RNA sequence: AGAACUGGCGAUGCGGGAUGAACCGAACGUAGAGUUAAGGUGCCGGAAUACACGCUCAUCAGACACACAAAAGGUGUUAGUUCAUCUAGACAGCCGGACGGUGGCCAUGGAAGUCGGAAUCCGCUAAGGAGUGUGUAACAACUCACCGGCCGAAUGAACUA
RNA sequence: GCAGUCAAGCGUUAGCGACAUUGCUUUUGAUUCUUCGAUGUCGGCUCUUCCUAUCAUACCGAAGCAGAAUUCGGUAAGCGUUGGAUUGUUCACCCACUAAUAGGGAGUCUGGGUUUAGACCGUCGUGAGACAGGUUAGUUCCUACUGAU
């Protein structure tokens, strides 16, 4: 056990001597200050003293007649995010705080002796985090009651590995793509395959993309899009299980596909090509992007997170009728999508060649920015739920953060010692949890880009992790054949 | 150099080259050593053999590197032609890999020579020499694919045309099967196939003819199809690059007849869109 | 060698918290000529090193296309990749490349043997 | 110059009359020539010919087996697929290197009668703290050429070898005075900077150093090989 | 490396082993007769260029302290084991069929089977490969995988000495 | 080499193991400016003799060999394989010309040096004394061949 060099006699003498105090009640300095919304709104000039931050925050409330708390920052070289006011004209800025705060996950929990196989995938349910499902090498998928940390009915029916599993955004039907050729449907309480499995696929399923609720009309169930090594994406009707059309534009395996809020299915493929297929176009490609040196390994969008919740916000209150649920999904999608006034769902594509590309599929095919600061392939790239921050995981043992819109580099984490696998985003964007080839789980504080806490315990090869929608609990899984839960 | 670098020594594949080097080392060096010989003499013999093998490998690699046309900065037209023909990036990467292998061989030979001068028993020196040879073979072993690709491109590069764009030239271009190949054959004392299909002269054949007591060279190319500047083949890319880089006007041909069954509107639109080349 | 709870046992484990302090010290450490080192501490410099020097070297193009497919009888490169999207920009690129190229555009007694240094082992 | 036209010329003159017949006759005679050479190609050549023939036969057998099998007819995440992959020491009772010429004697002085000098002819690692003393004190001499700092390390897991700096030597059997001397002496257990692998023990305390045993003989080889004791 | 144990030289003549201080035999006085161990019986070299069953072509075979470059390889030879073909015509030799959807699907100026690649179907039979090769811009042109017309009695494949 | 992988065959018949095979094995012809304690007498002149694992000449052969010219497998020792250069060691590198200026053993006039000459500088020791270096001084017809009576 290495020891940090102990403080010398000089350090002891310095520590023994008292120093300044933080009461700061007297002689508050006054300097001119300006207010300007972080995104677009430029403005409320004042020259106040070194007053408490709460007073400054409440000052802007009456200006806009909102009563809502707003996150505050200034000088956006300085990069400054009484203590802040004593550093020196400071140009202050504001943005919504999203008062709902997800408490940091620090405490571990006992393991569950469920399916005896390496874990492959896992995802939290949108309606409530109390239920969770994990995929593993075993052909059978199992749901878990997070409250009691116990398994649920076993999804018997598959004869090969369940590559991908995830709840539908409405939570009505779970999809569990099988390795061999098929995807099966399981409602939360069926305990058995719901009808005949979706078959007729030449190769294994790579990823699944549910139809967003905000686009789903009342009554009709959401469509289920699938991707596979065959290089084609089939659109499946959850009710009739029939395929309306299949697109084979991709000449190689489709790495992943995301059902955008505008009805466009942004997908990447091993052919180093990105094709924006759209359901509304009767299964036709509207535009094609080709800028990656290597193939595309992952895809993500700013509004993708809002799709997976299916109007089930952090409160977890289930809607009454499909129409009001769709309306609440649409309003939330507009809120997240219309961050910069207009609805613009930014897209980012992960390139294995130590590079990532920022894309705006709704506009010209010229890339917005070429995010390129990694040393190894970026395994996973995901937009922040807020949308202003972008993070990526790579095999180079580091996690890099980038600006959501301008592409400017922000910071890089180096806590992980081995290859970093997929990561998860907190419901409030305040904390990011990442898992790596190393047998450790870590969470990073976005507020200052510092290591918050370490969560070891897994035997080895923690392949994937997810964050609950409400943020109460965080699940994990790895090759140890043991599911472990984490909570504040 | 320029103008038909065919003089490259057409290196044999990796296995053949390694076998040749080993045979040369065995033949050009003494073989019969005995334990009773003085340790100094045995060590000197082993060091001499190792140094000879290393020097042979280094000389081979250096000759291979030098013989190549030095694509970098050679010429924009020649650079683009080579990039189209052999995918410049791959060729540069293969040459860099060869240079790295040569450097590794040099380092291994130096390290083994430094270590070899301390072994006491004859068996120790023999084992050190065997390890050095195995290291050299392993370094050479991974070079099979780049060496084969370089041999293929050399077989193709040697027969490539040789013309200087800076000189006075006039070229012939147009739609394929317009009779352009026949026009090239007739205008200059050159032999080219005149078969009636749209890819008769796949390669950029060079023709030479004299007028006004001055030599005037010419080139050939099948031309360009619709080709909206997104989907172009290597042959058509070579023609586009040649037209862009080359000197004074290239003759644009048009088959105003039933043959070349593209509407004359398409022929007009082709040159209208290619206008920036003018 | 005797079996025991010895080697196959952990002996060099570093502390997780100390890594951040070591990284900060390495980033902030500075020295002058008047300051000299006597004992360089043994620490995992590999983890501390490799700071945010974002350069992202060139892609591994060979992985997408092998040497054999690039050229040869089994060619799989009928069309160039990343070629110019338009003729005008290609013409401009060729023009400026040509201009740059134009911008770039028996022997005396050999060396004396006295220069045997700093050769001469 | 003049690209692949040679094919054109062949097409315009068409496979000279005797060429096809001569080629067929040579191909027919190939088996007889190979059989005759099986008796020719004497010492230093017959061995190579036999090795090549054996390799060709093995390749043919393996290709025939593959064709016959074809004629009949560890789960990983979605992102790792399509990508490249009782405490006794592994080598107990190592060879008993004796106290012998390995301590090579170097004759000192103009008149070689008071050598008193011993030289270690075995690979040794020292590091930064070598600091050669005055020449008069060189009772034991470890040559620089025979000093190695990075030794190959491997484990029966993923078969990945990575060169890592040598940290120290803890226990050399057979008179561990060699341990005090830092000699490799295959069979020794040495510490290696395993920070590259980044394996983490229970409790979140990442490990970056483990003791490994030298597998190969650095005396008879220019490389050092060791296996992690995990 | 080391232990106990047996024999010879040590201290040793004699026949043979070209010769070898460690090999085979062998109980050392002077002579004669006859029989042998070891080596042999073409000459030096005293004894059959004796009988009988087979092998050995060797560019320096073979007669070599038997020790290892020694594992296979030879369309080199002699002899043997197992599995199938069979007069419901044994192997090999001359002649024809080798189809139809089809020019499969995606890659696309050309991949009609033989530059890329997933399975390789069904209809069809004595039999047909979305193809084994030779060669073509594109089929096209020719062969066998497999079958039949003539033959005409044993044949093919893997191993052992 | 280590640790595997496929497994022609042998297996107590669970293990071995021929050939292949993965990780050590600055991807942009960048420059590492690297050349790391050889304790030993050998080194270089001329001429002859022997081998081929042969550089030229000679023989023929396989090549994107169209020629010039070039890459290489094999037969072949018949005849050739030259000249300057360092020393602040020449355990070796440079370039005149040729078609090439091939690699060794069988040691055999000349120069370093292998040894007591005499001395010196520094090392080491209370000193004789000898060196981690080093310089100066040096001395070592018997038989067989070629001609003749
Ligand atoms: Mg034509």
From Swiss-Prot, chain A:
GO terms for biological process: protein-RNA complex remodeling; ribosomal large subunit assembly. It is found in: Nucleus, Nucleolus. Keywords: Nucleus, Repeat, Ribosome biogenesis, WD repeat. Residues 19-101 are annotated as: Interaction with MDN1. InterPro entries: G-protein_beta_WD-40_rep, NLE, WD40/YVTN_repeat-like_dom_sf, WD40_repeat_CS, WD40_repeat_dom_sf, WD40_rpt. GO terms for cellular component: nucleolus. Changing residue 421 to E: Impairs interaction with NSA2. SUPFAM superfamilies: WD40 repeat-like (SSF50978). Residues 28-98 are annotated as: Ubiquitin-like (UBL) domain. WD repeats lie at residues 114-154, 157-196, 200-246, 249-287, 325-369, 373-412, 415-454, 457-488. Involved in ribosome biogenesis. Required for processing and efficient intra-nuclear transport of pre-60S ribosomal subunits. Interacts with the AAA-ATPase Midasin (MDN1/REA1), which is essential for the ATP-dependent dissociation of a group of nonribosomal factors from the pre-60S particle. Associates with the pre-60S ribosomal particle. Interacts (via WD repeats) with uL18 (RPL5). Interacts (via UBL domain) with MDN1 (via VWFA/MIDAS domain). Interacts (via WD repeats) with NSA2. Belongs to the NLE1/RSA4 family. This is Ribosome assembly protein 4. It comes from Saccharomyces cerevisiae (strain ATCC 204508 / S288c). The gene is RSA4.
Curated annotation (Swiss-Prot), chain B:
Residues 168-278 form the OBG-type G domain. Present with 28000 molecules/cell in log phase SD medium. This is Nucleolar GTP-binding protein 1. GTP binds at residues 174-181, 220-224. Belongs to the TRAFAC class OBG-HflX-like GTPase superfamily. OBG GTPase family. NOG subfamily. It is found in: Nucleus, Nucleolus. Involved in the biogenesis of the 60S ribosomal subunit. Associated with nucleolar and cytoplasmic pre-60S particles. Directly interacts with RLP24.
Swiss-Prot record, chain C:
Signal peptide: none annotated. Transmembrane segments: none annotated. The keyword Transferase does not apply. GO terms for biological process: regulation of ribosomal subunit export from nucleus; ribosomal large subunit export from nucleus. Coiled coil: none annotated. Its main location: nucleus. One of its GO terms (molecular function) is GTPase activity. One of its GO terms (cellular component) is nucleoplasm. The modification Phosphoserine is found at residues 15, 85. It is found in: Nucleus, Nucleolus. The keyword Lyase does not apply. Keywords: GTP-binding, Nucleotide-binding, Nucleus, Phosphoprotein, Ribosome biogenesis. Present with 67700 molecules/cell in log phase SD medium. GTPase that associates with pre-60S ribosomal subunits in the nucleolus and is required for their nuclear export and maturation. Belongs to the TRAFAC class YlqF/YawG GTPase family. NOG2 subfamily. This is Nucleolar GTP-binding protein 2.
UniProtKB/Swiss-Prot annotation, chain D:
Residues 1-42, 60-76 are annotated as: Disordered. One of its GO terms (cellular component) is preribosome, large subunit precursor. InterPro entries: NSA2_fam (IPR039411), Ribosomal_Se8/biogenesis_NSA2 (IPR022309). A motif (Nuclear localization signal 1) lies at residues 14-21. The keyword Nucleus applies. A motif (Nuclear localization signal 2) lies at residues 50-57. Residues 74-85 are annotated as: Interaction with RSA4. Pfam families: Ribosomal_S8e. GO terms for biological process: maturation of 5.8S rRNA; maturation of 5.8S rRNA from tricistronic rRNA transcript (SSU-rRNA, 5.8S rRNA, LSU-rRNA); maturation of LSU-rRNA; maturation of LSU-rRNA from tricistronic rRNA transcript (SSU-rRNA, 5.8S rRNA, LSU-rRNA); ribosomal large subunit biogenesis. The keyword Nucleus applies. It comes from the Eukaryota. Keywords: Nucleus, Ribosome biogenesis, rRNA processing. Residues 1-39 have a biased composition (Basic and acidic residues). Changing residue 79 to A: Abolishes interaction with RSA4. Blocks production of mature 60S subunits, and causes the accumulation of pre-60S particles. It is found in: Nucleus, Nucleolus. Component of the pre-66S ribosomal particle. Interacts with NOP7 and RRP1. Interacts with RSA4 (via WD repeats). Belongs to the eukaryotic ribosomal protein eS8 family. Ribosome biogenesis protein NSA2 subfamily. Involved in the biogenesis of the 60S ribosomal subunit. May play a part in the quality control of pre-60S particles. Under normal, rapid growth conditions, high levels of NSA2 would allow the progression of pre-60S particles through the ITS2 processing. Present with 8660 molecules/cell in log phase SD medium. This is Ribosome biogenesis protein NSA2. The gene is NSA2.
């Amino acid at each position: 056990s290495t020891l940090i060099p102990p403080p010398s006699k000089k350090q002891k003498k310095e520590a023994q001597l008292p120093r300044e105090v933080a009461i700061i009640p007297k002689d508050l300095p006054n300097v001119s200050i300006k207010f300007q919304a972080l995104d677009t709104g430029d403005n409320a000039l004042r020259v106040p003293g070194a007053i408490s931050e709460k007073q400054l925050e409440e000052l802007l409330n009456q200006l806009n007649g909102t009563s809502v708390p707003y996150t505050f920052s200034c000088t956006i070289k300085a990069s400054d995010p009484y203590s802040s006011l004593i550093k020196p004209q400071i140009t202050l800025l504001y943005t919504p705080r999203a008062v709902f705060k997800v408490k940091p996950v620090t405490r571990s929990s006992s393991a569950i002796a469920g399916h005896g196989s390496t874990i492959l995938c896992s995802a939290f349910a949108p309606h409530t985090s109390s239920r969770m499902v994990t995929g593993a090498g075993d052909n059978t998928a199992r749901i878990w009651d997070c409250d009691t940390q116990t398994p649920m009915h076993t999804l018997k029916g598959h004869y090969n590995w369940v590559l991908c599993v995830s709840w539908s955004p409405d939570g009505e039907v779970i999809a569990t793509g099988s390795m061999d050729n098929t995807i099966r449907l399981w409602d939360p309480k069926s305990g058995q395959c719901l009808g005949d499995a979706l078959r007729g696929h030449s190769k294994w399923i790579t990823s699944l993309s549910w139809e967003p609720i905000h686009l789903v009309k009342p009554g009709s169930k959401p469509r289920l899009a699938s991707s596979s090594k065959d290089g084609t994406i089939k659109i499946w009707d959850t009710v009739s299980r029939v395929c309306q059309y299949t697109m084979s534009g991709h000449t190689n395996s489709v790495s992943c596909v995301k059902w955008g809020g505008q009805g466009l299915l942004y997908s990447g493929s091993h052919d180093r090509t990105v094709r924006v297929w759209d359901i509304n176009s009767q299964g036709r490609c509207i535009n094609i992007l080709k800028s990656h040196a290597h193939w595309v390994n992952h895809l993500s969008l700013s509004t993708d997170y809002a799709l997976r919740i299916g109007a089930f916000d952090h409160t977890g209150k289930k809607p009454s009728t499909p129409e009001e649920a769709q309306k609440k999904a649409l309003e939330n999608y507009e809120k997240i999508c219309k961050k910069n006034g207009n609805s613009e769902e930014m897209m980012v594509t992960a390139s294995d060649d130590y590079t990532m590309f920022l894309w705006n599929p709704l506009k010209s095919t010229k890339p917005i920015a070429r995010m390129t600061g990694h040393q190894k392939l970026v395994n996973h790239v995901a937009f922040s739920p807020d949308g202003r921050y972008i993070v990526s995981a790579s095999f180079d043992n580091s996690i890099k953060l980038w600006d959501g819109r301008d592409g400017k580099f922000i910071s890089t984490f180096r806590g992980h010692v081995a290859s970093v696998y997929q990561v998860a985003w907190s419901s409030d964007c305040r904390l990011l949890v990442s898992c790596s080839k190393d047998t450790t789980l870590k969470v990073w504080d976005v507020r200052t880009r510092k290591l918050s806490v370490d969560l070891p315990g897994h035997k080895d090869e923690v392949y994937t992790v997810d964050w609950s929608v409400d943020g109460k609990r965080v699940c994990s899984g790895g090759k140890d054949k043991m599911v472990r839960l984490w909570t504040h | 150099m320029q103008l038909s670098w065919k003089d490259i020594p057409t290196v044999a594949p990796a296995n053949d080259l390694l076998d040749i080097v080993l045979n040369r080392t065995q033949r050009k060096t003494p073989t019969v050593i005995r334990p009773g010989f003085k340790i100094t003499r045995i060590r000197a013999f082993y060091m001499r053999k190792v140094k000879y093998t290393g020097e042979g490998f280094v000389e081979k690699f250096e000759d291979i590197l030098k013989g190549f046309p030095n694509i970098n900065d050679v010429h924009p037209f020649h650079r683009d032609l080579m990039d189209t023909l052999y995918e410049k990036n791959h060729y540069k990467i293969s040459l860099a890999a060869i240079s790295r292998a040569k450097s590794l061989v040099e380092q291994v030979a130096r390290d083994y020579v430094r270590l070899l001068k301390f072994g006491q028993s004859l068996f120790q020196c023999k084992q050190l020499k065997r390890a050095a040879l195995g290291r050299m073979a392993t370094i050479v072993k991974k070079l099979r694919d780049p060496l084969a690709y370089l041999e293929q491109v050399r077989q193709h590069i040697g027969r490539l045309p040789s013309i200087d764009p800076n000189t006075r030239t006039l070229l012939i271009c147009g739609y394929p099967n317009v009779g352009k190949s026949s026009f090239l054959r007739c205008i200059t004392k050159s032999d080219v196939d005149v078969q009636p299909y749209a890819f008769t002269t796949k390669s950029l054949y060079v023709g030479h003819f004299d007028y006004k007591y001055l030599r005037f060279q010419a080139i050939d190319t099948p031309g360009i199809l619709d080709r909206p500047t997104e989907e172009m083949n290597n042959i058509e890319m070579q023609s586009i690059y040649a037209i862009a880089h080359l000197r004074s006007c290239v003759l644009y041909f048009m088959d105003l007849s039933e043959q070349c069954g593209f509407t004359i509107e398409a022929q007009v639109k082709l040159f209208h869109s290619i206008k920036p080349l003018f | 060698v005797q079996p025991d709870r010895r080697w196959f046992g952990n002996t060099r484990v570093i502390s997780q918290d100390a890594l951040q302090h070591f990284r900060s010290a390495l980033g902030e450490t500075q020295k002058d000529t008047y300051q000299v080192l006597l004992r360089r501490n043994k620490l995992p410099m590999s983890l501390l090193e490799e700071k945010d020097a974002d350069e992202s070297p060139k892609a591994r193009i060979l992985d997408t296309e092998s040497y054999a497919d690039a050229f040869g009888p089994k060619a799989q490169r009928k069309r160039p990749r990343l070629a110019a999207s338009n003729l005008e920009d290609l013409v401009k690129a060729t023009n400026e490349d040509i201009t740059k190229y134009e911008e770039k555009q028996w022997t005396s007694a050999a060396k004396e043997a006295i220069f045997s240094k700093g050769q001469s082992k | 110059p003049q690209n692949d036209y040679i094919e054109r010329h062949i097409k315009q003159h068409g496979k000279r009359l005797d060429h096809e017949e001569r080629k067929r006759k040579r191909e027919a005679r190939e088996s007889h020539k190979i059989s005759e050479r099986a008796q020719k190609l004497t010492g230093w050549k017959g061995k190579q010919f036999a090795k090549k023939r054996y390799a060709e036969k093995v390749s043919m057998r393996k290709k025939i087996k593959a064709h016959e099998q074809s004629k009949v007819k560890d789960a990983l995440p979605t992102y790792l697929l399509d990508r490249e992959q009782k405490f006794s020491v592994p080598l107990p009772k190592v060879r008993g290197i004796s106290e012998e010429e390995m301590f090579k004697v170097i004759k000192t002085g103009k008149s070689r009668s008071k050598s008193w000098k011993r030289m270690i002819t075995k690979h040794t690692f020292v590091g930064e703290g070598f600091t050669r003393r005055p020449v008069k004190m060189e009772r034991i001499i470890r040559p620089s050429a025979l000093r190695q700092k990075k030794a190959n390390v491997t484990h029966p897991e993923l078969g990945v070898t990575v060169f890592l700096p040598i940290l120290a030597v803890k226990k050399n059997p057979q008179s561990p005075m060699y341990t005090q001397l830092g000699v490799l002496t295959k069979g020794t257990i040495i510490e290696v900077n395993v920070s590259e692998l980044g394996m983490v023990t229970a409790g979140g305390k990442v490990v970056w150093g483990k003791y490994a045993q030298v597998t190969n003989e650095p005396d008879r080889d220019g490389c050092v090989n060791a296996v992690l004791l995990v």
